[PDB]
Amino acid sequence: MCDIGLIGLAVMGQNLSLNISSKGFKIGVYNRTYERTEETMKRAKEENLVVYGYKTVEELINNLKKPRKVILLIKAGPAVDENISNILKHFEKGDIIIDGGNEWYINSERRIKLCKEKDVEYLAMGVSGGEAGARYGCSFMPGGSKYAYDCVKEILEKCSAQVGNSPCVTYIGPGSSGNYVKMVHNGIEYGDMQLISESYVIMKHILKYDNQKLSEVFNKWNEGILNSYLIEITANILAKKDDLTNNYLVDMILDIAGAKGTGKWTMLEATERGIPCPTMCAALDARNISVFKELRTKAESNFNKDNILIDPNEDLNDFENDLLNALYCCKIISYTQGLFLLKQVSEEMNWKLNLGEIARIWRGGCIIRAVFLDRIANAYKNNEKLELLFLDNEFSDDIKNKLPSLRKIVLMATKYSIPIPAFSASLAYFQMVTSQNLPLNLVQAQRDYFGSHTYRRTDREGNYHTLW
Amino acid sequence: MCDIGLIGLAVMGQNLSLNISSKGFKIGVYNRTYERTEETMKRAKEENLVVYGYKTVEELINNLKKPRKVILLIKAGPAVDENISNILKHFEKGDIIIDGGNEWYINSERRIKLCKEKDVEYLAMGVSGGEAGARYGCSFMPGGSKYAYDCVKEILEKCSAQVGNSPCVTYIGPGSSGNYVKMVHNGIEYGDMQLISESYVIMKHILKYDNQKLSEVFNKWNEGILNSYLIEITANILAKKDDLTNNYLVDMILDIAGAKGTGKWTMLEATERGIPCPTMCAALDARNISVFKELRTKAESNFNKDNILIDPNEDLNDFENDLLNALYCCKIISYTQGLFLLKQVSEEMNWKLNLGEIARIWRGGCIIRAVFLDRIANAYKNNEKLELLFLDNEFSDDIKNKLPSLRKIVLMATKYSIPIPAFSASLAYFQMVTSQNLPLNLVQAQRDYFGSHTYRRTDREGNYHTLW
Ligand SMILES: O=C(O)[C@H](O)[C@@H](O)[C@H](O)[C@H](O)COP(=O)(O)O
Ligand SMILES: O=C(O)[C@H](O)[C@@H](O)[C@H](O)[C@H](O)COP(=O)(O)O
């Protein structure tokens, strides 16, 4: 009888099935369109692996060891609820459903209560790493039933990416906390990509770097503190030549960014809970503005973007190194926002999130993977209740040393009309959060003036209304 | 019998009752606690007006002319639905309920459906102007039943603020469109207040203006193109002396901004629909960051904000005039965002909003009222298909002449570490919306690299996936 089952056999589910099989576990798979089941078994025997395929969910469930465990890798929608409903007709007390898709956390909360009515345990698990990580080692973010986690943790530990001896998996917490952490991972991923792209236009249009010089700089950055998956693939992307023309492939790609929800969800949560995530908004702003390609073209035909002619007396020596420090400084600031969001939500939901553990399993497998995440992990291992990431002693020193470079980059970009919303939003966020006194005193005065909303004073307690 | 009735006698409801009476209409009022109903009648006596009070809602409904019209000014919550149901137990076919509170538009849609099942017409009406506007003239944003609007239009026209002889009321559209327009008014208002507060901190910390000079500058600006309620009251606020100390009152106000939902709702709507509103995020970011007053104090103690020492050879000539032009430029950009939001939402909701009419009724009564809004109303009445506000010929000229001032302001603020998120977000929004090519090509290549999401090409049709 099978150790675990998996429903949903796109390339993601196929690769995870091969991953589980290659680790010595016997796995049964199902997919309504049977050719995907056939493709999985074909790929398994081509790699000398064993994957059992069944034509129905009933036959798959019947071949599962007790306690029965099934992984769901189905595109988000009513097809997930239809499969859960069908599974609950054959599962019994103590069996486990594991949803591995990018889900909105409120949806998983509903499915947890529904399965619990039949005493079926539910694990809502975020997965990061794509098709490659699904096959060779990804980052698992399971949350929900701790009992469910314990029954499957050996599979997750062996199939996840390994950072030294440490598997990239942890018990996130109860309920839908696993979906929430994976959502925030993608939100942070949105920010890193927007910051990298802004570094790309800064060197292209201020330093006049061609695509070959750009790829070299990113590869040089990947050898240092900025070592990361996104910096690495960016260096590869910028050097890629087109095979339909004689241009660079990145110059032939239409600048309309897609998006599938997780970035928007992070933003909705930050707005609703009053948690400031300015770098998040900048990344979303860029993607949402890019959609209106025809309007942007007509708008530029009225507001012509003149070609950037650099002042010959412009001090641009060490500017490339200033940009390195600024981009690193912005990652500290951006991750501070994301980790602050996770901390406040954990406190509001009583999830008891372990931010050091979350940072640890983000060191490999996932998209934001970087040696940067090992520094974050160490910061929270030393202070589990750290309020803001850059208040850690080491990160604080990094900020104090690299912030002048950030100001220099924002200055030059502003002077030459280069849009850098994520860079400037990150600098603004740091300056406001480190300001004991902000101009919201005037805002409060205005609100009392036109709305009689009252205000508080600095020198005494109470709520005061003034006849201005 | 009474021409109309009003339920809910806080200061807003009391003043509107006096307003309706002062315009010649016979109005009956009711409040759950009878103490407020008496107070309304005493104040009516003292102002040589007559307002009829009733002890229960049944007597009020019995004294209404057909078609019966009742105005609701109840604090948002279940009490609104409770009063609606209580009213539906006595209204007949063709009677009208008008809700005037700051309501979330989805909740009004529900109340419109229920009242329509009882054949009672519903009017969800946004109201802006505060206590003074309720008494002497506010901006009414009624949406829903066109039959209900036509039956109550003369009361709304005479009680609204008058710009010349044009009353600040219009039929917004069907459904809850009136609540949505009022919500976006507050969103724009949030942006105006944040931009003004950044002008204040720029002059205070870069130019070293004290409060007397600050008040003089805003008064000076109120005489020119920036003539507006918010600029005017800002001048009064900055000059206001505290009577408990010998300091300026605004300096004794704790910098923790309140917020009661409408600004947050505007951002939630923009985020969910993918409509870029970066200036709204900056306004909300500033208010949300201000709440963390204790963390901000601890943060500055570690990140000491040095005294802003201005370079003696810094060219600050015409800097005050650059700030004037920059603030006016940001208002153009911010209203471009908010009016684009209204346009896109009108399309998606099939509301057929008249942006020229909405701008017209925002010229008086409401908080954002300004001669600026007459220019906006004229721009849309000249071209009802205008897409972006700053694409109007005269607004386009303003951007071209004033955008260099905005760059100069952002440059100086960046150099001297002044957080100005709304100014920088406005400038970034303009530079992105007017960019034919944005670095989202790199983002699209990354998403195809790690997620196989495919990309589009600039030179041919189709969706392409590259083995990078
Ligand atoms: O962690 C990952 O492996 C990716 O982030 C994964 O979740 C997927 O690629 C998302 O769809 C990307 O997000 P967008 O499609 O919204 O850019
Ligand atoms: O248009 C108006 O007359 C005001 O905007 C009114 O709606 C009220 O004063 C809001 O409560 C202000 O908004 P906040 O309280 O969220 O700042």
Side-chain angles (χ1 to χ4, degrees):
Chain A
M1 285 179 173
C2 288
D3 289 306
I4 197 169
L6 190 141
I7 300 175
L9 293 176
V11 177
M12 200 74 183
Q14 295 183 11
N15 285 15
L16 187 60
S17 296
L18 297 178
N19 195 340
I20 294 167
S21 177
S22 75
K23 291 318 194 294
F25 303 99
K26 106 170 74 159
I27 172 170
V29 299
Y30 164 87
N31 194 78
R32 181 47 182 87
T33 300
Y34 186 70
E35 69 188 16
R36 296 301 229 165
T37 309
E38 271 168 339
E39 182 186 359
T40 303
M41 295 179 292
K42 167 179 168 296
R43 294 180 61 196
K45 314 303 181 302
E46 286 187 344
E47 302 188 58
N48 198 15
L49 303 172
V50 176
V51 176
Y52 299 95
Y54 302 96
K55 291 178 182 174
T56 60
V57 283
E58 305 95 65
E59 197 181 10
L60 166 63
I61 292 177
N62 282 341
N63 283 276
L64 295 177
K65 289 182 183 174
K66 175 84 206 341
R68 301 182 182 92
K69 306 172 281 300
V70 58
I71 295 179
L72 298 185
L73 278 181
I74 307 164
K75 205 161 90 74
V80 176
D81 296 294
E82 290 166 10
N83 279 273
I84 292 177
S85 189
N86 209 265
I87 290 171
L88 291 180
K89 297 157 67 170
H90 305 280
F91 267 13
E92 318 174 301
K93 183 179 89 70
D95 294 327
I96 296 151
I97 298 179
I98 302 141
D99 183 15
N102 283 346
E103 187 54 71
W104 169 243
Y105 74 109
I106 299 295
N107 287 332
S108 296
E109 294 283 353
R110 175 184 78 240
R111 291 158 183 166
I112 285 170
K113 301 177 184 177
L114 184 96
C115 290
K116 194 57 182 175
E117 284 165 19
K118 303 299 304 306
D119 274 285
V120 172
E121 305 292 326
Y122 202 89
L123 208 61
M125 182 174 66
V127 184
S128 182
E131 300 168 3
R135 180 55 184 89
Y136 297 106
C138 52
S139 182
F140 289 115
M141 286 147 274
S145 166
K146 181 55 158 58
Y147 157 88
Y149 178 82
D150 293 338
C151 290
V152 81
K153 80 181 188 73
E154 179 181 358
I155 301 174
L156 302 190
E157 286 163 7
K158 289 177 177 175
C159 297
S160 65
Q162 310 291 315
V163 174
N165 68 293
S166 187
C168 286
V169 62
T170 187
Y171 176 70
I172 297 292
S176 57
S177 62
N179 287 147
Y180 206 97
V181 167
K182 173 63 205 299
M183 176 194 69
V184 170
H185 159 94
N186 276 180
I188 297 174
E189 159 198 293
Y190 274 46
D192 283 346
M193 296 164 62
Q194 177 61 25
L195 288 168
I196 290 171
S197 76
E198 284 172 27
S199 310
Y200 152 59
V201 289
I202 281 162
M203 290 184 293
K204 181 183 181 68
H205 286 112
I206 277 181
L207 297 183
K208 308 302 180 181
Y209 284 178
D210 69 281
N211 277 25
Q212 204 67 35
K213 180 60 171 175
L214 290 168
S215 184
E216 293 182 340
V217 172
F218 278 107
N219 270 316
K220 178 172 68 179
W221 289 356
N222 202 40
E223 301 173 4
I225 56 177
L226 280 173
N227 175 263
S228 62
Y229 175 77
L230 286 177
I231 287 293
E232 176 186 346
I233 74 166
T234 294
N236 299 345
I237 283 167
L238 294 173
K240 183 77 173 188
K241 295 281 292 185
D242 191 12
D243 61 348
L244 308 181
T245 76
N246 39 69
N247 306 114
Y248 286 99
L249 180 53
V250 73
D251 293 328
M252 309 305 301
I253 297 177
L254 185 55
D255 57 332
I256 294 187
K260 298 198 173 178
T262 55
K264 173 169 73 178
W265 298 343
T266 304
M267 195 56 243
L268 292 173
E269 279 291 306
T271 300
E272 171 57 39
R273 301 182 184 265
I275 297 159
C277 287
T279 308
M280 166 74 40
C281 180
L284 268 186
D285 284 335
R287 296 203 188 188
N288 290 337
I289 290 170
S290 75
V291 168
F292 307 96
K293 174 74 172 184
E294 290 162 285
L295 183 51
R296 285 193 286 114
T297 300
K298 173 168 143 105
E300 201 194 299
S301 79
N302 183 83
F303 303 103
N304 284 8
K305 297 274 303 188
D306 307 318
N307 281 266
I308 308 98
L309 244 177
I310 308 296
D311 194 312
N313 298 330
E314 197 67 66
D315 193 24
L316 291 185
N317 290 310
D318 297 306
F319 188 80
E320 187 189 294
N321 190 75
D322 281 332
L323 181 59
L324 202 175
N325 288 313
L327 176 59
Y328 196 81
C329 196
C330 283
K331 288 198 63 177
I332 300 174
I333 292 168
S334 180
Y335 282 62
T336 292
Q337 301 163 30
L339 292 167
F340 188 87
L341 170 62
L342 284 180
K343 180 176 187 289
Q344 289 291 130
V345 174
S346 177
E347 295 166 351
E348 293 178 2
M349 305 290 297
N350 193 39
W351 280 346
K352 315 242 181 153
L353 290 187
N354 189 317
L355 300 191
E357 274 296 280
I358 293 170
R360 180 185 62 76
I361 70 167
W362 284 351
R363 297 178 308 166
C366 71
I367 305 306
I368 65 178
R369 83 180 84 118
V371 306
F372 185 59
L373 274 303
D374 191 74
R375 298 191 61 201
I376 296 180
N378 279 326
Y380 282 99
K381 299 292 183 183
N382 289 332
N383 186 358
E384 50 176 350
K385 287 308 200 300
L386 183 64
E387 302 106 300
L388 292 170
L389 173 63
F390 56 60
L391 280 179
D392 168 276
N393 290 323
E394 269 179 42
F395 282 104
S396 172
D397 284 353
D398 276 317
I399 289 285
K400 295 173 180 174
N401 288 320
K402 303 186 190 308
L403 195 74
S405 300
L406 177 53
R407 290 196 303 269
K408 177 76 173 293
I409 296 304
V410 179
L411 276 177
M412 223 54 50
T414 303
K415 175 177 179 178
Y416 291 103
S417 299
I418 293 175
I420 45 145
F423 265 77
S424 57
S426 299
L427 178 59
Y429 169 86
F430 169 83
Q431 291 168 345
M432 276 184 298
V433 76
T434 63
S435 293
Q436 170 179 329
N437 294 315
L438 286 176
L440 282 315
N441 59 323
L442 177 57
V443 165
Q444 280 298 88
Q446 294 162 334
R447 294 182 67 252
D448 186 57
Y449 201 132
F450 67 71
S452 298
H453 295 285
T454 77
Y455 56 86
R456 293 163 62 188
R457 288 180 61 102
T458 63
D459 63 342
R460 64 195 68 205
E461 291 296 294
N463 300 306
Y464 297 87
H465 174 60
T466 295
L467 311 175
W468 298 86
Chain B
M1 285 178 169
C2 300
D3 300 281
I4 203 168
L6 192 141
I7 296 181
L9 293 180
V11 60
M12 203 68 51
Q14 296 184 12
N15 286 1
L16 185 58
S17 306
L18 303 180
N19 192 346
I20 293 173
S21 179
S22 76
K23 295 312 179 300
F25 300 101
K26 184 172 177 175
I27 173 181
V29 295
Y30 164 84
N31 195 72
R32 188 239 308 175
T33 74
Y34 191 68
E35 36 200 347
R36 302 320 226 188
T37 304
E38 282 175 342
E39 181 174 25
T40 309
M41 287 181 290
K42 333 198 101 174
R43 294 184 57 203
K45 186 260 147 187
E46 285 155 48
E47 304 195 4
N48 297 103
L49 310 168
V50 48
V51 173
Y52 296 88
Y54 296 94
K55 315 192 107 163
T56 67
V57 47
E58 296 90 67
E59 314 152 52
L60 171 56
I61 293 174
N62 282 332
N63 277 91
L64 297 176
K65 284 183 231 202
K66 284 224 207 174
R68 300 184 184 89
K69 321 169 198 64
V70 56
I71 294 176
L72 304 192
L73 281 182
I74 305 164
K75 203 162 49 183
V80 177
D81 302 305
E82 281 176 9
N83 285 267
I84 289 172
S85 64
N86 209 15
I87 290 166
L88 290 179
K89 309 162 125 168
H90 300 89
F91 268 4
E92 305 171 48
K93 164 173 171 203
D95 291 335
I96 298 151
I97 300 177
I98 303 141
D99 181 14
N102 270 344
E103 191 49 79
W104 170 244
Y105 74 107
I106 299 289
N107 298 333
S108 284
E109 292 288 347
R110 169 182 59 95
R111 291 155 181 168
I112 291 175
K113 303 156 203 158
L114 162 62
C115 291
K116 192 56 180 178
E117 93 186 0
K118 316 301 177 96
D119 273 286
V120 158
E121 305 295 326
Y122 201 90
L123 212 58
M125 184 176 65
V127 185
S128 181
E131 282 157 29
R135 173 61 179 88
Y136 286 112
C138 48
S139 178
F140 292 122
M141 285 144 273
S145 169
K146 186 54 165 58
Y147 154 86
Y149 178 87
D150 288 331
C151 270
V152 81
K153 98 159 191 157
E154 143 183 40
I155 301 179
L156 297 182
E157 289 171 349
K158 290 186 171 180
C159 295
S160 65
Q162 310 290 304
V163 183
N165 89 315
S166 186
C168 289
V169 61
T170 188
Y171 177 69
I172 297 294
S176 61
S177 55
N179 289 134
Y180 203 99
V181 167
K182 173 63 203 298
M183 178 192 67
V184 175
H185 161 95
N186 278 187
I188 293 174
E189 160 196 294
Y190 273 49
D192 279 358
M193 298 162 62
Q194 181 61 28
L195 287 165
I196 286 172
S197 74
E198 291 175 15
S199 306
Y200 155 61
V201 78
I202 283 163
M203 289 184 291
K204 180 181 179 68
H205 282 117
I206 294 191
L207 294 181
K208 309 306 178 182
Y209 286 0
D210 62 357
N211 275 40
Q212 183 176 326
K213 173 61 173 178
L214 285 170
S215 176
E216 184 253 1
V217 169
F218 281 104
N219 269 318
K220 184 167 50 181
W221 289 352
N222 194 50
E223 295 184 18
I225 58 178
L226 282 167
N227 175 262
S228 60
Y229 172 80
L230 282 180
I231 289 285
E232 184 191 311
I233 72 163
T234 291
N236 304 344
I237 281 162
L238 292 176
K240 190 70 176 186
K241 297 297 264 157
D242 185 20
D243 56 5
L244 302 182
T245 68
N246 287 318
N247 306 123
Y248 285 97
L249 182 53
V250 75
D251 294 327
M252 308 309 299
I253 295 181
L254 185 61
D255 58 329
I256 296 183
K260 296 184 175 179
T262 57
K264 169 167 68 181
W265 301 345
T266 302
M267 174 57 48
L268 293 176
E269 280 288 310
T271 298
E272 171 63 42
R273 302 171 184 266
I275 301 165
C277 291
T279 307
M280 189 68 222
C281 181
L284 272 180
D285 280 343
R287 295 206 192 190
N288 288 341
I289 288 172
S290 73
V291 174
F292 305 104
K293 172 74 175 182
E294 293 83 359
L295 183 54
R296 285 193 287 115
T297 297
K298 183 208 299 226
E300 181 171 329
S301 82
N302 170 263
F303 296 107
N304 282 13
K305 292 216 149 214
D306 300 314
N307 290 292
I308 301 149
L309 291 203
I310 307 301
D311 195 304
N313 268 41
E314 190 78 67
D315 178 50
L316 297 181
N317 263 267
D318 297 306
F319 189 77
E320 190 196 288
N321 195 259
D322 283 333
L323 183 60
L324 194 175
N325 289 329
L327 178 58
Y328 196 82
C329 193
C330 290
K331 285 196 66 174
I332 301 178
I333 290 162
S334 180
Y335 280 66
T336 294
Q337 305 171 28
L339 291 170
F340 189 75
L341 173 59
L342 275 186
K343 183 196 231 306
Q344 298 300 99
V345 171
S346 179
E347 303 280 89
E348 297 180 353
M349 300 293 294
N350 200 37
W351 281 340
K352 305 292 172 56
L353 294 185
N354 192 312
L355 297 193
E357 275 291 288
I358 296 176
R360 179 187 65 76
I361 69 167
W362 283 350
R363 297 174 306 166
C366 69
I367 303 304
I368 65 173
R369 67 180 179 267
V371 305
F372 183 61
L373 279 143
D374 194 48
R375 297 190 61 199
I376 295 179
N378 285 343
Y380 281 97
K381 292 175 184 304
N382 169 258
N383 176 6
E384 301 236 309
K385 284 331 151 203
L386 184 54
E387 293 166 283
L388 295 171
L389 173 59
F390 50 52
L391 286 185
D392 171 270
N393 287 330
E394 292 187 357
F395 282 105
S396 169
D397 286 347
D398 271 329
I399 293 286
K400 299 175 183 294
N401 293 326
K402 300 188 204 297
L403 193 80
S405 294
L406 177 51
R407 290 197 305 265
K408 176 65 179 293
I409 296 304
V410 176
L411 275 175
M412 297 298 308
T414 302
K415 182 181 177 180
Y416 291 99
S417 304
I418 309 295
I420 47 144
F423 267 82
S424 56
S426 300
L427 177 59
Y429 170 87
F430 171 81
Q431 287 167 346
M432 276 185 296
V433 172
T434 67
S435 284
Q436 173 179 340
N437 297 316
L438 285 173
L440 280 314
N441 59 321
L442 180 58
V443 165
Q444 277 299 96
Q446 292 161 338
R447 295 180 67 252
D448 188 61
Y449 199 124
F450 66 70
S452 296
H453 293 288
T454 78
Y455 57 88
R456 293 162 55 181
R457 286 181 63 104
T458 64
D459 63 353
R460 62 199 74 202
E461 190 213 336
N463 305 296
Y464 296 83
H465 175 57
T466 295
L467 309 177
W468 302 82

